[PDB]
Amino acid sequence: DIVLTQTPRSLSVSPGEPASISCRSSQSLEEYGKNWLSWYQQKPGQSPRLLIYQATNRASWVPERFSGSGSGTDFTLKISRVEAEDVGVYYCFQDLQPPNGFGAGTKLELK
Amino acid sequence: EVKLVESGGGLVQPGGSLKLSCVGSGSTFSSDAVSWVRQAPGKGLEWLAGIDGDGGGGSTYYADSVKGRFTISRDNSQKTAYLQMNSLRTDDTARYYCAECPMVLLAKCSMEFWGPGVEVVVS
Amino acid sequence: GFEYNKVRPHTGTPTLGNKLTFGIPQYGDFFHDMVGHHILGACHSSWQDAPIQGTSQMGAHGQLQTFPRNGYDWDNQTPLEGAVYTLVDPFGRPIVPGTKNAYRNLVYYCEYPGERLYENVRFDVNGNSLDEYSSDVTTLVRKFCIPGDKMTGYKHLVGQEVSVEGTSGPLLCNIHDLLDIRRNVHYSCNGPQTPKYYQPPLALWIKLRFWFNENVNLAIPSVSIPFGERFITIKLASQKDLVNEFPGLFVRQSRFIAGRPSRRNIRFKPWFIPGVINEISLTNNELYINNLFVLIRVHKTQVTHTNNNHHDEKLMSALKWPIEYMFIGLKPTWNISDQNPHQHRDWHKFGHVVNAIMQPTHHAEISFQDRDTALPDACSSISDISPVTYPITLPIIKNISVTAHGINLIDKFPSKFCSSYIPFHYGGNAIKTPDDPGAMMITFALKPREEYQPSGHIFYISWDTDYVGSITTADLVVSASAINFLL
Amino acid sequence: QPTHHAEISFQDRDTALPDACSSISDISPVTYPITLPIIKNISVTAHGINLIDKFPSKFCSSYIPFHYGGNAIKTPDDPGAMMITFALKPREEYQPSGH
Amino acid sequence: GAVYTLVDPFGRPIVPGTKNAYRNLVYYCEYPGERLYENVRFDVNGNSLDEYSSDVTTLVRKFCIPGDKMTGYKHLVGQEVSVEGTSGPLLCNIHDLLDIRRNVHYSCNGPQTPKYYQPPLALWIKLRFWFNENVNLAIPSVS
Amino acid sequence: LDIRRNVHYSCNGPQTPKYYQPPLALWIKLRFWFNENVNLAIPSVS
């Protein structure tokens, strides 16, 4: 079915510098006028936590540095300034139709 | 506050069956779709199964890797969800989470509420 | 004697929003009354997919629609404990979210869509418009000139629903004096204004009002001018100004409130995303004219727009012919604005219409045991899917004043005084007293309609209001009858 | 059929669906007599002239009472009660203008 | 799950097999004054000057009666007239883009309401002829 | 098989019991022998 490919695997970005995470889908993830990709963040030692839903919206806890990806088949999460609490693993998650799938998983660690 | 508690994983031989309970305290757990998600060690997250809430039906949806091997269920009287693993192999050792979408049907739901999960080791 | 004849439309293929031309032939000497007959086609909304939960989609009139997540309030934030949201039909039937082509919106016509249809009626004789009038003066003469005895048939002519009376069974009542059988009387409507999945083709019979329509003796001769010279131009309403959509989907919330008593509250809120209505096909577009085989009262009208706050006065010099009565109608421009969700209900209403909402709720209190019976063990509070809505028409004018040139004439009279006492006291049997506070009547010269003899004759309309100004404006409509001489 | 509905939950763990429901109808329902027309077209055919020829029922039954008769003729509420005018105005004065 | 019992029309139980257990509720026709006079004829040694029926009476009811004089006419032919009552004060929320309002209900009591015992009903049925329209059209009784 | 809307009636005036009655504007007509017709008005110069 739909396979999500994460082009970046590890970035090693300097603190205070922007970071970019790419996820491409097999076909279009859009249905009923809204995109159906989610972004999940997992900190080391913690359970997964919803970061972005519907590929442009965000959860209530999300600070104002996580961009609302893109549109169509390719999406790119962008962090404006990594604050050393964003070190972890990011996932792009399919929300079109079951069986839903997870991305490759990109590990962000500072340098 | 909506909470989830998983129980539980342990030392299981490569031929067997497990019954994972996920108890929810969120006052709407019976109308909330429940997903079971896998994180293998040295590997990213992997979606396993999903089930709808009450109202509309009780349809279950499955990943193609574990379809037929797995059996998801829910008992809303005790606010519990159940995951049955049958004939699990050696690669099934992983951290298992139950996620509770705050939405009835599990078609395009967002997994908002999670739990600590349980680590199931197969040996 | 007299007979009737038909006039085919000269334009060819009428379409809503486009001008229709009718041509008067030569078949007799006198013709006074005429009716445009149309058969508006069947309409229905397009099939629409059921929304996913947790999604907010942009709705009509700038008002966002939303299908909230469980455990949240309506605005999909500020969480509400126990709230569970599903989708239901307007008659309570469940709708599965995400289903392709799951529901239709319910199309309903305007209230009095026949008067809304003829937006601009003009009588042209190679140009040089003898009479040009609109829907607003037609509503004014509806609220004033129609006797009210002949209303339901008129409500059949313009496609307005008429209430049908039904009765329940026999019921026991106790009679208190200081045991009896009575039946409740209910009322229910069925016409085009009731929202339906499939509106049948609606037959509209629209009367045309000119100076010769009042009496049979005032018919103009058709031999003075040729028949290849008179035309009737009708600019119709748009397809969006006649039929509206009603929500074919409702988000139903069940809220469980724990404790004692344990309450189950079922409430509803419409999900109204604008669909597509198919084009109305006008059918059998005829113009019935009565042919008779063998000084005048002209509706000199002018509708103007006023934007000043809390007080206003206009400038006009067009009216020079002597008059006999003076009918005023003030309508806020939000009544006919497309941003108004109730503009189809309120286009004809002269006044500021607030909405009063009855929410008829079924309540029940159940005790499971006989030891602790002080409070009920459980309670049910179930509301209806759509509430009871009363359009309450409050006045906008606090004082009216028609200031003339050398005389002040009407000066700061109260709105209720004019609108109630003047129709009640003047006009004879013809003038019905309107139910709208903004529908006003003022007298200048003589008694309005009792006889065909003037006993005397002889105009800046101004008001002091408590209504808002540039936020929401107000327009004035007149149906004053001027006395004209033909020579 | 005016029916009272109630939804009662006996317990606070599984509150998705009501535990019990009551649906009580009235003994005698509310009956509306809806009077639908039977005529699609009316025609009073005379000898040498056709006179009324295939007029719609609504046209007669609604427009003719509305426009003719003065204040005397109430407009009927029944579609099958139609009114048709042949000679002159029905009731305004005691003088025939033609027949 | 279907369980069938017998009830009175006002909800009172009736035991099956009971001798003389219930009565049907008699109710008059709507407009029984017009229904009563099925054939009115004015004879002068035969030679019927006017013979008419209930149908033309219903026609002139729906057309010729002004409608302001309904209730009294509905009292003349024994037709029930709806009586208006009001509930208590009720709370409403006024939406403009908090109020006290009373519901208005209607209820009938006349012969057309089914009752166990109909009281004696007085009908005052008018006779329609050519001379009933005006007082000046009355025929002489001396000819 | 059919779609119908219920019609209800409700009042709002002074006869409805309220906690706070607004000020009521009463316009009361006076009835005499000259109020029936405009031609029956008595002269004010006599």
mmCIF file of C-alpha atoms in Angstrom, chain C residues 47-335:
data_model
loop_
_atom_site.group_PDB
_atom_site.id
_atom_site.type_symbol
_atom_site.label_atom_id
_atom_site.label_comp_id
_atom_site.label_asym_id
_atom_site.label_seq_id
_atom_site.Cartn_x
_atom_site.Cartn_y
_atom_site.Cartn_z
ATOM 1 C CA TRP C 47 -24.598 14.548 -2.363
ATOM 2 C CA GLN C 48 -21.983 15.355 0.270
ATOM 3 C CA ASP C 49 -19.464 13.187 2.087
ATOM 4 C CA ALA C 50 -19.721 12.770 5.844
ATOM 5 C CA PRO C 51 -16.916 14.675 7.614
ATOM 6 C CA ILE C 52 -14.179 13.087 9.687
ATOM 7 C CA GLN C 53 -14.185 13.743 13.426
ATOM 8 C CA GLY C 54 -11.892 16.447 14.745
ATOM 9 C CA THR C 55 -12.068 18.448 11.509
ATOM 10 C CA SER C 56 -13.210 22.057 11.174
ATOM 11 C CA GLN C 57 -14.411 22.989 7.690
ATOM 12 C CA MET C 58 -15.291 26.469 6.465
ATOM 13 C CA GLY C 59 -19.054 26.972 6.486
ATOM 14 C CA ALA C 60 -21.544 29.441 5.081
ATOM 15 C CA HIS C 61 -21.810 33.163 5.922
ATOM 16 C CA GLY C 62 -18.300 33.240 7.381
ATOM 17 C CA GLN C 63 -19.322 30.946 10.248
ATOM 18 C CA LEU C 64 -16.979 27.997 10.750
ATOM 19 C CA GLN C 65 -18.410 24.491 11.056
ATOM 20 C CA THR C 66 -16.729 21.916 13.260
ATOM 21 C CA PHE C 67 -17.114 18.261 14.289
ATOM 22 C CA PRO C 68 -15.452 18.144 17.716
ATOM 23 C CA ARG C 69 -13.378 15.383 19.238
ATOM 24 C CA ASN C 70 -14.673 13.398 22.193
ATOM 25 C CA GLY C 71 -14.206 15.041 25.563
ATOM 26 C CA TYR C 72 -14.217 18.559 24.097
ATOM 27 C CA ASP C 73 -16.664 21.441 23.822
ATOM 28 C CA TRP C 74 -18.153 22.679 20.546
ATOM 29 C CA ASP C 75 -15.154 24.870 19.659
ATOM 30 C CA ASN C 76 -12.834 21.778 19.688
ATOM 31 C CA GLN C 77 -10.946 23.317 22.645
ATOM 32 C CA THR C 78 -11.668 23.913 26.387
ATOM 33 C CA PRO C 79 -12.330 20.226 27.115
ATOM 34 C CA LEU C 80 -15.779 19.149 28.309
ATOM 35 C CA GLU C 81 -15.885 15.923 30.305
ATOM 36 C CA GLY C 82 -18.145 13.176 28.974
ATOM 37 C CA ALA C 83 -19.005 14.754 25.610
ATOM 38 C CA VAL C 84 -19.369 12.214 22.783
ATOM 39 C CA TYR C 85 -20.028 13.412 19.229
ATOM 40 C CA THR C 86 -21.699 11.403 16.452
ATOM 41 C CA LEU C 87 -23.468 12.312 13.203
ATOM 42 C CA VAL C 88 -27.234 12.032 12.747
ATOM 43 C CA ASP C 89 -29.812 12.805 10.087
ATOM 44 C CA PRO C 90 -32.289 15.651 10.798
ATOM 45 C CA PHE C 91 -34.836 12.911 11.644
ATOM 46 C CA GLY C 92 -32.494 10.990 13.953
ATOM 47 C CA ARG C 93 -31.009 8.434 11.571
ATOM 48 C CA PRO C 94 -27.289 7.694 12.095
ATOM 49 C CA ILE C 95 -24.746 8.676 9.443
ATOM 50 C CA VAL C 96 -21.338 6.974 9.368
ATOM 51 C CA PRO C 97 -18.455 9.495 9.180
ATOM 52 C CA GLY C 98 -16.218 9.339 6.131
ATOM 53 C CA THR C 99 -18.936 7.832 3.934
ATOM 54 C CA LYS C 100 -18.863 8.954 0.310
ATOM 55 C CA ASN C 101 -22.186 10.560 -0.719
ATOM 56 C CA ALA C 102 -23.648 10.183 2.762
ATOM 57 C CA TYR C 103 -26.239 12.970 2.990
ATOM 58 C CA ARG C 104 -27.968 15.814 1.173
ATOM 59 C CA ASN C 105 -28.866 19.259 2.414
ATOM 60 C CA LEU C 106 -32.592 19.975 2.571
ATOM 61 C CA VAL C 107 -33.639 22.604 0.047
ATOM 62 C CA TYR C 108 -36.389 24.994 1.108
ATOM 63 C CA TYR C 109 -37.873 27.914 -0.776
ATOM 64 C CA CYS C 110 -38.146 31.448 0.520
ATOM 65 C CA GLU C 111 -41.096 32.621 2.541
ATOM 66 C CA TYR C 112 -43.305 34.203 -0.124
ATOM 67 C CA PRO C 113 -40.894 33.219 -2.932
ATOM 68 C CA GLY C 114 -43.319 34.561 -5.513
ATOM 69 C CA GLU C 115 -42.869 38.136 -4.329
ATOM 70 C CA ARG C 116 -39.104 37.558 -4.144
ATOM 71 C CA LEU C 117 -39.162 36.205 -7.713
ATOM 72 C CA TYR C 118 -40.366 39.376 -9.467
ATOM 73 C CA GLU C 119 -37.484 41.550 -8.306
ATOM 74 C CA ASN C 120 -37.998 44.303 -10.894
ATOM 75 C CA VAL C 121 -41.231 44.621 -12.891
ATOM 76 C CA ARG C 122 -41.200 47.347 -15.546
ATOM 77 C CA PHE C 123 -43.793 48.418 -18.123
ATOM 78 C CA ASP C 124 -41.978 49.862 -21.148
ATOM 79 C CA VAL C 125 -43.473 51.640 -24.175
ATOM 80 C CA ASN C 126 -40.353 51.951 -26.371
ATOM 81 C CA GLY C 127 -38.531 52.776 -23.190
ATOM 82 C CA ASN C 128 -40.114 55.513 -21.052
ATOM 83 C CA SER C 129 -41.078 53.268 -18.132
ATOM 84 C CA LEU C 130 -44.682 53.931 -17.116
ATOM 85 C CA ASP C 131 -44.395 51.877 -13.917
ATOM 86 C CA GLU C 132 -41.313 50.219 -12.433
ATOM 87 C CA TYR C 133 -41.657 48.487 -9.074
ATOM 88 C CA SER C 134 -39.842 45.909 -6.968
ATOM 89 C CA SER C 135 -40.428 43.159 -4.405
ATOM 90 C CA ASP C 136 -40.412 45.532 -1.424
ATOM 91 C CA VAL C 137 -43.446 47.551 -2.520
ATOM 92 C CA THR C 138 -45.205 44.238 -3.206
ATOM 93 C CA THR C 139 -44.491 43.184 0.380
ATOM 94 C CA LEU C 140 -45.755 46.585 1.571
ATOM 95 C CA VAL C 141 -49.055 46.220 -0.290
ATOM 96 C CA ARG C 142 -49.250 42.657 1.027
ATOM 97 C CA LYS C 143 -48.962 43.820 4.635
ATOM 98 C CA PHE C 144 -51.361 46.731 4.033
ATOM 99 C CA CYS C 145 -53.694 46.365 1.049
ATOM 100 C CA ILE C 146 -54.605 42.648 1.005
ATOM 101 C CA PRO C 147 -57.761 42.295 3.162
ATOM 102 C CA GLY C 148 -56.611 39.176 5.025
ATOM 103 C CA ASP C 149 -59.801 37.292 4.234
ATOM 104 C CA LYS C 150 -58.210 36.433 0.872
ATOM 105 C CA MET C 151 -54.820 35.533 2.320
ATOM 106 C CA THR C 152 -54.539 31.724 2.172
ATOM 107 C CA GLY C 153 -55.428 31.659 -1.514
ATOM 108 C CA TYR C 154 -52.916 34.454 -1.998
ATOM 109 C CA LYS C 155 -50.541 32.271 0.003
ATOM 110 C CA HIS C 156 -51.325 29.588 -2.576
ATOM 111 C CA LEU C 157 -50.637 32.074 -5.379
ATOM 112 C CA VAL C 158 -47.148 33.049 -4.195
ATOM 113 C CA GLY C 159 -46.178 29.597 -2.922
ATOM 114 C CA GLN C 160 -46.380 30.296 0.820
ATOM 115 C CA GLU C 161 -47.279 27.360 3.051
ATOM 116 C CA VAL C 162 -50.606 27.505 4.901
ATOM 117 C CA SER C 163 -50.943 25.885 8.320
ATOM 118 C CA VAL C 164 -53.087 22.736 8.461
ATOM 119 C CA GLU C 165 -54.981 22.028 11.686
ATOM 120 C CA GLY C 166 -55.022 18.582 13.264
ATOM 121 C CA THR C 167 -56.468 17.175 16.466
ATOM 122 C CA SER C 168 -55.288 14.619 19.002
ATOM 123 C CA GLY C 169 -57.510 12.096 20.749
ATOM 124 C CA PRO C 170 -59.908 12.741 23.601
ATOM 125 C CA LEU C 171 -58.206 13.748 26.847
ATOM 126 C CA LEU C 172 -59.298 14.070 30.474
ATOM 127 C CA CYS C 173 -59.267 17.537 32.058
ATOM 128 C CA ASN C 174 -60.396 18.681 35.494
ATOM 129 C CA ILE C 175 -62.606 21.777 35.642
ATOM 130 C CA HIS C 176 -61.977 24.121 38.569
ATOM 131 C CA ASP C 177 -64.757 26.460 39.685
ATOM 132 C CA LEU C 178 -64.863 28.777 42.688
ATOM 133 C CA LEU C 179 -64.287 15.672 34.716
ATOM 134 C CA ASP C 180 -64.328 16.997 31.148
ATOM 135 C CA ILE C 181 -63.180 15.778 27.724
ATOM 136 C CA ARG C 182 -61.044 18.014 25.499
ATOM 137 C CA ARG C 183 -58.946 17.568 22.359
ATOM 138 C CA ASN C 184 -55.671 19.384 21.725
ATOM 139 C CA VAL C 185 -55.452 21.359 18.481
ATOM 140 C CA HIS C 186 -52.093 21.310 16.691
ATOM 141 C CA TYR C 187 -50.914 23.032 13.524
ATOM 142 C CA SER C 188 -48.435 21.856 10.916
ATOM 143 C CA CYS C 189 -47.169 23.082 7.543
ATOM 144 C CA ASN C 190 -46.211 21.186 4.399
ATOM 145 C CA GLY C 191 -45.315 23.736 1.718
ATOM 146 C CA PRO C 192 -42.082 24.757 -0.007
ATOM 147 C CA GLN C 193 -40.846 26.615 3.084
ATOM 148 C CA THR C 194 -40.571 23.310 4.943
ATOM 149 C CA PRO C 195 -37.067 21.919 4.269
ATOM 150 C CA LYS C 196 -37.285 18.823 2.077
ATOM 151 C CA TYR C 197 -34.821 16.488 0.400
ATOM 152 C CA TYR C 198 -36.712 16.914 -2.890
ATOM 153 C CA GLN C 199 -38.807 20.015 -3.522
ATOM 154 C CA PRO C 200 -41.610 19.384 -6.051
ATOM 155 C CA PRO C 201 -42.063 21.817 -8.967
ATOM 156 C CA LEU C 202 -43.648 24.914 -7.446
ATOM 157 C CA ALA C 203 -46.376 26.739 -9.379
ATOM 158 C CA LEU C 204 -46.232 30.516 -8.877
ATOM 159 C CA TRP C 205 -49.051 32.829 -10.002
ATOM 160 C CA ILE C 206 -47.778 36.389 -9.577
ATOM 161 C CA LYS C 207 -50.117 39.349 -9.943
ATOM 162 C CA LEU C 208 -48.903 42.513 -11.667
ATOM 163 C CA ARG C 209 -49.728 45.846 -10.025
ATOM 164 C CA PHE C 210 -50.181 49.051 -12.036
ATOM 165 C CA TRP C 211 -52.493 52.059 -11.984
ATOM 166 C CA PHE C 212 -55.254 50.240 -13.905
ATOM 167 C CA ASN C 213 -55.345 47.091 -11.741
ATOM 168 C CA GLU C 214 -57.453 48.653 -8.970
ATOM 169 C CA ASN C 215 -60.758 48.878 -10.867
ATOM 170 C CA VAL C 216 -62.207 47.425 -14.054
ATOM 171 C CA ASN C 217 -63.284 50.910 -15.177
ATOM 172 C CA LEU C 218 -59.707 52.275 -15.133
ATOM 173 C CA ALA C 219 -58.397 50.057 -17.949
ATOM 174 C CA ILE C 220 -56.395 52.005 -20.539
ATOM 175 C CA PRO C 221 -57.532 51.733 -24.182
ATOM 176 C CA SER C 222 -55.407 49.556 -26.457
ATOM 177 C CA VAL C 223 -56.428 51.448 -29.616
ATOM 178 C CA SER C 224 -54.641 54.724 -28.763
ATOM 179 C CA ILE C 225 -51.188 53.142 -29.178
ATOM 180 C CA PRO C 226 -50.189 50.110 -31.299
ATOM 181 C CA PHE C 227 -49.789 46.671 -29.750
ATOM 182 C CA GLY C 228 -46.303 46.326 -31.251
ATOM 183 C CA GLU C 229 -45.017 48.922 -28.793
ATOM 184 C CA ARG C 230 -45.777 47.713 -25.231
ATOM 185 C CA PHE C 231 -43.390 45.356 -23.434
ATOM 186 C CA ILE C 232 -43.098 44.029 -19.887
ATOM 187 C CA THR C 233 -39.569 43.523 -18.552
ATOM 188 C CA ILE C 234 -39.241 41.355 -15.444
ATOM 189 C CA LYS C 235 -35.807 41.069 -13.846
ATOM 190 C CA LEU C 236 -36.004 37.966 -11.666
ATOM 191 C CA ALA C 237 -34.234 36.996 -8.469
ATOM 192 C CA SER C 238 -31.086 34.914 -8.527
ATOM 193 C CA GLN C 239 -31.161 31.179 -7.874
ATOM 194 C CA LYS C 240 -29.448 31.917 -4.535
ATOM 195 C CA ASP C 241 -32.178 34.421 -3.567
ATOM 196 C CA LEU C 242 -35.080 31.958 -3.931
ATOM 197 C CA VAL C 243 -34.009 28.580 -2.498
ATOM 198 C CA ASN C 244 -31.810 28.035 0.549
ATOM 199 C CA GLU C 245 -30.228 24.963 2.090
ATOM 200 C CA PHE C 246 -31.036 23.523 5.514
ATOM 201 C CA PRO C 247 -28.528 21.242 7.292
ATOM 202 C CA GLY C 248 -28.917 17.613 6.268
ATOM 203 C CA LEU C 249 -26.419 16.569 8.942
ATOM 204 C CA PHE C 250 -26.363 17.227 12.683
ATOM 205 C CA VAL C 251 -23.512 16.724 15.129
ATOM 206 C CA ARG C 252 -25.139 15.033 18.129
ATOM 207 C CA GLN C 253 -23.414 15.239 21.507
ATOM 208 C CA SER C 254 -24.225 12.946 24.405
ATOM 209 C CA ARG C 255 -22.787 14.243 27.674
ATOM 210 C CA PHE C 256 -22.617 12.018 30.742
ATOM 211 C CA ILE C 257 -22.470 13.941 34.027
ATOM 212 C CA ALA C 258 -21.565 11.567 36.849
ATOM 213 C CA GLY C 259 -22.449 11.740 40.531
ATOM 214 C CA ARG C 260 -25.991 11.851 41.883
ATOM 215 C CA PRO C 261 -28.195 12.338 39.936
ATOM 216 C CA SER C 262 -26.350 10.781 36.991
ATOM 217 C CA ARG C 263 -27.404 12.889 34.007
ATOM 218 C CA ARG C 264 -27.437 11.967 30.314
ATOM 219 C CA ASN C 265 -27.842 15.107 28.190
ATOM 220 C CA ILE C 266 -28.391 14.774 24.434
ATOM 221 C CA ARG C 267 -27.923 17.984 22.434
ATOM 222 C CA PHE C 268 -27.535 18.758 18.734
ATOM 223 C CA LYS C 269 -25.804 21.341 16.559
ATOM 224 C CA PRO C 270 -26.103 21.522 12.757
ATOM 225 C CA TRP C 271 -23.211 20.799 10.398
ATOM 226 C CA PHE C 272 -23.916 23.099 7.450
ATOM 227 C CA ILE C 273 -21.396 22.995 4.600
ATOM 228 C CA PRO C 274 -22.878 24.622 1.463
ATOM 229 C CA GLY C 275 -23.642 22.107 -1.260
ATOM 230 C CA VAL C 276 -24.736 22.562 -4.861
ATOM 231 C CA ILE C 277 -28.355 23.035 -5.946
ATOM 232 C CA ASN C 278 -29.251 22.161 -9.531
ATOM 233 C CA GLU C 279 -30.420 24.947 -11.828
ATOM 234 C CA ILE C 280 -34.093 25.874 -11.580
ATOM 235 C CA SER C 281 -35.831 25.232 -14.905
ATOM 236 C CA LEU C 282 -38.684 27.683 -15.412
ATOM 237 C CA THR C 283 -41.593 25.909 -17.099
ATOM 238 C CA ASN C 284 -44.936 27.016 -18.609
ATOM 239 C CA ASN C 285 -44.012 30.697 -18.344
ATOM 240 C CA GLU C 286 -47.272 32.351 -19.384
ATOM 241 C CA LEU C 287 -48.920 35.744 -18.855
ATOM 242 C CA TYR C 288 -52.679 35.452 -18.376
ATOM 243 C CA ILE C 289 -54.441 38.660 -19.452
ATOM 244 C CA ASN C 290 -58.156 39.417 -19.124
ATOM 245 C CA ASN C 291 -59.648 40.966 -22.269
ATOM 246 C CA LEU C 292 -62.879 42.960 -21.963
ATOM 247 C CA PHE C 293 -65.031 43.279 -25.089
ATOM 248 C CA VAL C 294 -67.276 46.306 -25.584
ATOM 249 C CA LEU C 295 -57.844 60.781 -12.232
ATOM 250 C CA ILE C 296 -55.772 57.619 -11.741
ATOM 251 C CA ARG C 297 -53.853 56.241 -8.762
ATOM 252 C CA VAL C 298 -50.197 55.471 -9.533
ATOM 253 C CA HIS C 299 -47.746 53.705 -7.213
ATOM 254 C CA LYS C 300 -45.031 56.366 -7.378
ATOM 255 C CA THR C 301 -42.366 54.477 -5.435
ATOM 256 C CA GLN C 302 -38.739 55.066 -4.441
ATOM 257 C CA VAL C 303 -36.606 52.857 -2.177
ATOM 258 C CA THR C 304 -33.471 54.461 -0.750
ATOM 259 C CA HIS C 305 -30.555 53.472 1.484
ATOM 260 C CA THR C 306 -29.595 55.253 4.724
ATOM 261 C CA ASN C 307 -26.400 54.725 6.730
ATOM 262 C CA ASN C 308 -26.354 57.466 9.395
ATOM 263 C CA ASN C 309 -26.254 56.487 13.067
ATOM 264 C CA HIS C 310 -29.078 57.052 15.593
ATOM 265 C CA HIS C 311 -30.733 59.758 13.424
ATOM 266 C CA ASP C 312 -31.035 60.400 9.698
ATOM 267 C CA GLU C 313 -32.681 62.655 7.109
ATOM 268 C CA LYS C 314 -32.649 62.333 3.317
ATOM 269 C CA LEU C 315 -32.953 64.592 0.267
ATOM 270 C CA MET C 316 -35.536 64.085 -2.477
ATOM 271 C CA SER C 317 -37.538 66.154 -4.962
ATOM 272 C CA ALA C 318 -39.053 63.606 -7.381
ATOM 273 C CA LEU C 319 -42.580 63.447 -5.914
ATOM 274 C CA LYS C 320 -44.658 66.327 -7.295
ATOM 275 C CA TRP C 321 -48.009 64.654 -7.939
ATOM 276 C CA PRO C 322 -50.640 64.958 -5.176
ATOM 277 C CA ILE C 323 -51.069 61.945 -2.893
ATOM 278 C CA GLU C 324 -53.768 60.479 -0.618
ATOM 279 C CA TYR C 325 -51.982 58.134 1.839
ATOM 280 C CA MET C 326 -48.365 57.291 2.589
ATOM 281 C CA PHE C 327 -47.082 53.764 3.364
ATOM 282 C CA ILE C 328 -43.603 53.474 4.878
ATOM 283 C CA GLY C 329 -41.433 50.424 5.348
ATOM 284 C CA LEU C 330 -38.035 50.412 7.057
ATOM 285 C CA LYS C 331 -35.965 47.288 6.498
ATOM 286 C CA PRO C 332 -32.392 46.857 7.769
ATOM 287 C CA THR C 333 -30.086 45.920 4.904
ATOM 288 C CA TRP C 334 -29.041 42.871 6.944
ATOM 289 C CA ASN C 335 -32.502 41.426 6.225
#
